[PDB]
């Protein structure tokens with residue numbers, strides 16, 4: 001299998017290296033020379049343009065920053081692709097954008113999946129990413145051997161756009177939980193309840209969630225959590241702010257009522273203006289900006 | 292060891308609690324000013340008395356299960372002088388941290404040992420003797436109390452000094468309320484995006500957003516057939532009771548000057564929903580997010 005990998009950034013570069021490492025022929029394009037060089041150093045044949053990268057490919061993977069860039073990449077490359085090429089978009093983009101590019105691809109006789117990922121650079125490098133997939137089950141079956149060497153988990157979420165929708169809905173919940181957990185630890189401290197004691201209660205009770213059992217925003221109860229390491233990501237505020245922007249687009253596009261998610265979105269947008277580089281659990285320290 | 296216990300408050304939690312004490316071979320002296328509650332308790336072996344002070348006069352331990360801080364205060368005022376010195380008072384009511392510490396001090400000024408030990412698990416937990424007790428006060432007092440708590444309890448956790456039981460409970464329940472709303476928002480958003488309830492369930496429960504509000508209390512019928520959504524939102528944990536705890540959380544916020552943006556937002560949402568739907572499981576808040 002020959003794979004064209006379009007976007008060789010902080011996620012794309014290690015993903016593509018795992019593909020090389022699993023026996024695929026990987027062709028590549030990135031507009032940053034430092035990204036393209038890094039990738040050629042691990043065996044990707046890099047080309048000057050995306051249409052050239054796509055020319056001989058059975059599978060085309062995108063890992064790009066916005067729906068607008070993904071769309072312009074599709075219209076740039078679709079005529080260069082061979083028929084029945086399989087397109088996998090692993091970018092995190094809106095549901096609307098996902099569905100538009102899916103339809104554009106299939107109109108050219110291609111097969112297309114949305115497959116955005118969770119796990120970050122660390123997951124990408126360790127080949128433990130979780131892919132949330134939208135599209136036809138038979139297209140996913142065909143893609144499975146390409147995805148497997150990048151992935152710890154591959155979940156079929158439904159028809160085109162479902163992958164994007166599942167990730168966005170999970171991350172909106174996550175954001176709300178990280179804030180609620182933070183509020184809880186600060187309230188407890190002002191009530192004279194120790195952090196270990198609250199941790200022991202909540203983790204054994206109905207309030208338990210990853211935001212506390214793994215991402216505990218106070219130092220001590222979970223020695224590996226970002227709070228014990230100057231809030232080094234982990235999952236940056238910048239990235240969480242990005243996901244919540246997409247959740248707010250989805251909310252606006254559907255007319256949905258999402259009071260806590262929208263509140264969380266405003267909290268993180270404001271926090272990202274100052275602390276975009278910190279793990280999102282660092283929000284515990286911005287609560288008095290609220291009043 | 293077998294002990295004489297006065298049980299003040301024989302309502303839908305106190306009655307089954309008192310029944311389990313009788314089953315464990317304790318002599319239980321009960322009082323409740325609602326004769327119907329008292330009659331039900333007598334049927335399961337509680338010796339019912341004409342007045343609270345009479346019930347406490349010959350008791351080694353006095354348990355209160357009462358609706359509010361004010362009723363606890365009034366009860367302690369009415370009975371502390373009647374109890375034998377160094378009687379152990381356990382308050383398993385859910386009341387404000389401020390109120391807890393006030394009644395704790397009151398009990399101690401009368402020569403009585405006192406713990407706060409509010410419970411979670413509701414009436415079914417009460418009947419099954421699987422309640423979680425979250426305890427505030429001295430280690431040695433809790434050591435004294437353990438034989439009495441065990442026949443009612445699935446978990447006993449020592450949370451810290453007087454008031455810490457109440458604090459731990461109210462922090463966990465605030466988090467729960469926020470999570471239950473956030474889960475509802477996600478499921479509605481999914482429905483509007485065309486993502487199925489089952490698919491969203493599968494994702495969130497396998498990802499970082501997983502929590503009891505989805506995995507046990509799923510607010511759409513289907514994915515968790517035992518959840519209240521499948522039974523006309525019969526509680527479960529009523530909106531009335533969540534609204535009361537949320538009130539207690541807002542009291543704790545106001546007493547400390549803490550900042551709890553989502554917890555306060557969740558309190559406002561539940562206070563509105565409680566005006567007409569006090570009787571429904573708190574998962575039913577999902578109704579407010581749909582047209």
Ligand SMILES: C[C@@H](CCC(=O)O)C(=O)O
Nearest residue numbers: 148149150151152153154
């Ligand atoms: C466990 C994983 C297989 C992919 C792999 O080999 O990394 C999956 O089933 O998604």
Ligand SMILES: C[C@@H](CCC(=O)O)C(=O)O
Nearest residue numbers: 420441442444445446447
């Ligand atoms: C919860 C208590 C045991 C009492 C029970 O099984 O009812 C304990 O294990 O501390």
